[model samples]
Target: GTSQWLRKTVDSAAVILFSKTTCPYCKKVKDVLAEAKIKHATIELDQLSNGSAIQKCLASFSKIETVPQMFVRGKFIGDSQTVLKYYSNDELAGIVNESKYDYDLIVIGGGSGGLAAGKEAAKYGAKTAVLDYVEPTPIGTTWGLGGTCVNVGCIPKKLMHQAGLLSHALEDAEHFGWSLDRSKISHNWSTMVEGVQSHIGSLNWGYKVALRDNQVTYLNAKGRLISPHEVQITDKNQKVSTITGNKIILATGERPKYPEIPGAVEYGITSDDLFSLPYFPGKTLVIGASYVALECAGFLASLGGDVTVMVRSILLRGFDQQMAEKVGDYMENHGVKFAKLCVPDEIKQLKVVDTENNKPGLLLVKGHYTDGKKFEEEFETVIFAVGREPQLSKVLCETVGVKLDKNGRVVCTDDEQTTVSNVYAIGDINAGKPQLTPVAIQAGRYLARRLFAGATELTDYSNVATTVFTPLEYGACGLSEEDAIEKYGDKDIEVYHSNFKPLEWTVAHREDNVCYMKLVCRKSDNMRVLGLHVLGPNAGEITQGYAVAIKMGATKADFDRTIGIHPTCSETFTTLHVTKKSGVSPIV
Candidate 1:
């Protein structure tokens, strides 16, 4: 009866440590287990009334009469010295990890976040895999690895924004005493698209190489959750296979949303198709007022194209409204047209017949607005930038018992844990997190460290600095004025403001009173800086340093004491002296 009891106890637990209550040798073994954060059952022989009997029971199986005995996976592993050697060589953790599934971790959607998590988990000696698949757009636009940021979103968008800036540089160079001809300056759409695609291709290859080098398996297939610990993968050939993992992460991200109007899908393009369009978008009509809409409209106008932006309500909906309006005004002054309070009701295509010759017919866009306004305009392109929706249709979340919010985004806790114990969500697919590439990457890495490396630190999603790459480039970090006022009453917060022109703009004769900066601080916390907003050139680069300072709990006094650079747009922050309560003009 005693032999069966000893066998049953060792078989039931993954790791079993037997020791006396106050033995020094037992302390050493316990310290190693605690350092590794391994879960195991311990029996204090000295405290148990039947401790001598249990020791005699264990002696029947092994000849060792030692007090501190270690059994991993139901097999004796010697004393404290043996456990120390196993821990030093990293062999014991893997054997006693005790996973019930094939893989320790499986990440869905191989975007920035998912890939980072997979690689990080693998680094901690966890068997990890990532599955990603891109569905083709209506116009048949498809891309490879690296997700939206590297393929069509941030990388390509920034490069094209730079291309537009080059045009402005050419115009300003004439004033800078550069003897260059303006008429010969022309941008070739095909050439620019080719170069952008080439760079994106290289990034795609690099992501693949990094995954391989890190020993993380990447499957170019669509993934659907079958259970809390299982996923169904469908490859390119449409063959279905099932894989199991102890933990799963959802990082499907999001895609551009199309309106329900007629001809939108057939006639209009999105940010996905804009960067690599085969031909020049000669006369473009951009719909929506999001940052995506304005960035596209701004760059198109700057690249010598006739561009018009149609907005139903406001621009940069979540940003500071004052900065948002200033950016709109700057774009309008730079030759971009804006149509306010207009929403598309219907879109019709009218093809012009060419009876006299065999040439292709011209395409005309018939757009009907909601306010009984109609325009039959001919244009080479119509792009949509309304917003983005989470990609959860294919995941079959409902069948797998994962929860989603009202907006259809996966709901998760602060630590990125989903409703299901073994399932988690990250990136844009998770609700209530900033939908940016860098944010996704950081969240993903931190999650893997927590799951496999016994890390307890969580990602801080506050005070994230971001930029809108319009003609003037608006950048801000932390709460908007409205958010600050709503959260902490207006009386409790102080706003420091300024409007200064950049030094380079003076030489180029650019518009004055366009570059503005604002700092929001809490009155109760020694005027601790809460928000920083800037509208000017190089706003992203300017706000990055301030973001670090704000994260470190910098105060208004700290900023005032720092030395300011001469004639720089960022120096305006240190010189902000006008308070909103003073009711005085911020232009100094």
Candidate 2:
């Protein structure tokens, strides 16, 4: 059956491994496939890098995170490891077997990265299998089988977050001519969450079938590793079974960290519990001062929920302080209430304070600034916008001698290899500050080549860009002002900043929307741009080009020389009129 199996998908058992002509692993894999007789097609990851048209098409189709992912008979076999396993097993002798896995590479997580890694290994003639505890690995969401990004991280959050953005646009639509009762369209937060989760469920089924068609074993159970090559899987009913592999990868992603605030458990729900709530409470108090808190509180406000965001320190401490403050100010202007630098002393009981409407609220003893201040307010629900915690406890690091950072991410080398040689960690489980999805997938593919095809290359984590999808989307990469000053000395750095309204808003006649940008460079070096920061529409897209530029250590001359894509807001980057005071480099 000469089907266009892997040609159409990345996770299929059949796939083309993309590599440069000189790449040793790429060549090694190709030769082995010929000797063992395997089939695949290749695509240059560079051509499909983030935000490219080809990459967009790939994302929409397969929801895959990285390249070199293989498909088998239209089913996904994962990446190089999966490729290695397929031929190593006699399964390739005649027909693809789906009853049980008989391959060399076996990935334990069904997340997109895991699936890709499995497929890559299988391409090398290794027998490939993927085990996911979620019933059907969702290609896109959390409740379903796909993994964290699809199931819990990107898709659902993005979808739900869109509601906030849409509501804002629509709320301000009166300025542009369309008139509607602002009171009529109440943000149905609960319904939106349900819709997003439901969509993820559908995707899970599709991913599972993709594995089946590729002849890659897909198991649904709580998979536990008993040994380096052995996994004990416990199904939903608590029944146990085991599977073995020559190599194992731990992609068991992350979950929200519920703080142990005294009485907190009894009083409020964590971010994970946000989607489960029937409705967001009015005057909702969210505790935490990170991006999660900011995004959730902002979203709740867009939905007309009275949001009170409380934090221990200035939000976004890891990012630019000025920019973080600007975002905080924007949140305030949009209706989110802020209570900063206050730690919760204890949780107060949630009782029906308003009998007429039966709305619930929180009671708390203020810990710091207002200690002993008995705070009582009406709220329908309280959400904890605290950040996520990686699931490293169950991993039993001591058994494998794996090292964990203070925050608990697995310590790994540049290739994502852990202390254990054959075992690797990727995604949230591994170290490197950025906990974003794309980084994990990149690491997965990079490691795949190193382990199976003998690639000695390391992933360059520098200048990796990211975006915060807030009301004013903030995106940045490379060094910040403080870091730049540390390296270049405060006397040598230059900072350029500008603020304006987007052109689209002018035609649409919308106001109160603002776009801000900041560029950091070496004062005397002229063209050497160290960082790019923007808070505006399509910030994510804009950040990508600059990420490539910064990664290449693009100088200020590069930006000055690049042709402008006119009539676009991004063109501002190239034509900035030095609106701010020129400052010395801040590196000392």
Candidate 3:
């Protein structure tokens, strides 16, 4: 009779407890649950007619023979010690509030990060919703649901970079014994634009279908946090509504920044509009030397566009300066012009006489350099690829008392939590984290697991591998030499470097020493790998595997022992023996 009763109660009750009427521990657990207003069934086994039988039944199930045994959702939760631990940690309260809220989790942003967060939460039986909106560009350019990566950022950027590569591949075809008229082959801007945009449209639809399949609600509206637990959403038609959630995630991401100069806004375009430009950008001036700047300039030059990169100071700030300058040098050698230590003061677009048409046709760009040098040039386009800023100012972060850093990015803890309780921030909007798509997606999924699925693992932002899609792609993982030096003094680190030419570039007669790789190791820790950098073909593919080894604390000896694949650019790393201090040439 006691076995039958215990099994039925555990199966039916939201929470079940076995206790003695006069036990002090039993009373404490009962009082705590009562204060939380959690509905729980309590059984006084000692008062039952079959007291001995019930005690044996409870001991067999719980394996403790304890008086204050507890069970939640049909799972045994140990004795009084476990009950107090759950209550003290607020885990019990979180579970209790699951049914009280409209949703267990609400992610504000339909970007990659937000979508991942919502879907992961839903997988753990938490009701989730993702809210996203596209604020039109200055030129009234708008996109669909998949955020910057699928629309304006990585996806479109890589495709355009690939277009430039194909143009280069065609140039190399003549050397590869392929007979083709280079004069007849020309890139079609509209055709490339249409293909990229079509792929983006399909991705947008795919995201919507995924959200529905995962049982996550996708809202195409702008979301604002009114409080820690509430969000206000405004639709395209100005219809406003409120939604409540026990947990809120902010993955609003960021957008490209434009300079505050005259005609910069009126005439100059950014990456947001470049991918889908209606007409071909004939002679373009790319401003700044950020990776974005170099990539845009590299591709444009490869596609036979008269490309010029004007730099204010340095290239790829915050990365390895040696690698950065090498990248700039390669681009210059390949015909992309560079204007160093110069910045545009003002941009004035004036109608100029066209030599071919003998009419007022081409637009003349008038600007002055910082060195008191004034210059005038005819250009069809000017692109600003300086950098990007977080999208927090307009997202209403201040209303909910969320703290921001000096850079105007959201201040978040290691676990991606904001200052406001139960509210978290992830992706580009979060400060001190790598602004990459994979990083954001991983963080979002981890945050959901910790909140809903009782996971304690965190998203590690260190040693993240990334690639710059220039003509010669530069991929890297771990710290830069400058950063490694700064963190562990210059004398305590060893730098191993090597230069190799790709087999594919041999026939094309590409310049030697243009492709390079480096490994920065700590002297005190048996030469533990601290940084890895590579610049060559498929650098991203080469660096990805090394990133895993670095994350597992691989040392220089480990790398030396691993057999490398023959006849590959990546094999240069396995044979890297020359230290920078020895002044030995790494060329092989």
TM-score of each: 0.83, 0.78, 0.83
TM-score of 3: 0.83
TM-score of 1: 0.83
lDDT of 2 by residue, 195-294 (tens): 8877877788878777765656777777776666677888878998888765578887776665677766666676555543444466688888877777
In model 3, state the lDDT of residue 149: 91
For residues 1-588, what per-residue lDDT tens digits would candidate 3 score against the true structure?
557756645543335678899899999888888786654556777876876787777766788777898775446776788877878898887654335457767898888799888887776556788999999888778889888898988898899899998987887889999999999988877688899999999999999999999878888999888988898899999999999987889998888888988878777888887876766777889988988889988988888888898888899998888889888888999889987777776777665324354232245555566777866776778889888997776446677789998888889899998999779998999899999999999999888766654344799998999898888899999889999999999999999999989888889987788899999999999999999999998888999999899999999999999888989888888888999999999888
Q: How far is candidate 2 from the true structure (C-alpha RMSD, Å)?
A: 10.1
Where is model 1 poorest over a 10-residue stretch in terms of lDDT? 352-361
Candidate 2 Cα misplacement greater than 4 A, ranges? 1-103, 134-142, 351-367, 370-378, 454-456, 507-514, 524-526, 579-588
State model 2's lDDT.
0.67
On TM-score, the candidate that comes out on top is: 1
- Model 1 misplaced stretches (Cα beyond 4 Å): 1-99, 351-372
Clashing pairs in 3: none
Pick out the ten consecutive residues of candidate 3 with the lowest summed lDDT.
352-361
- The lDDT ranking, best first, is 1, 3, 2
What does candidate 1's lDDT look like per residue over 1-588, in tens digits? 546657755543346688898899999988888788764557777876667887888876556768788875456777888888888999878766655767778999988899888887776556778998999989788898988898879899899999999998998898999999999989887788899999999988998999888767899999988889888999999999999987799988899999998888887889988887777777788999999999989988888888888888899998999889999999998899887777776666654324354222234555556677875666657889999998786356887878898899988889899989768898988889899999999999998776664344799999999999998899999989888989899899999998889888778888777788999999989998889999989999999999999999999999999989997889888878999999999875
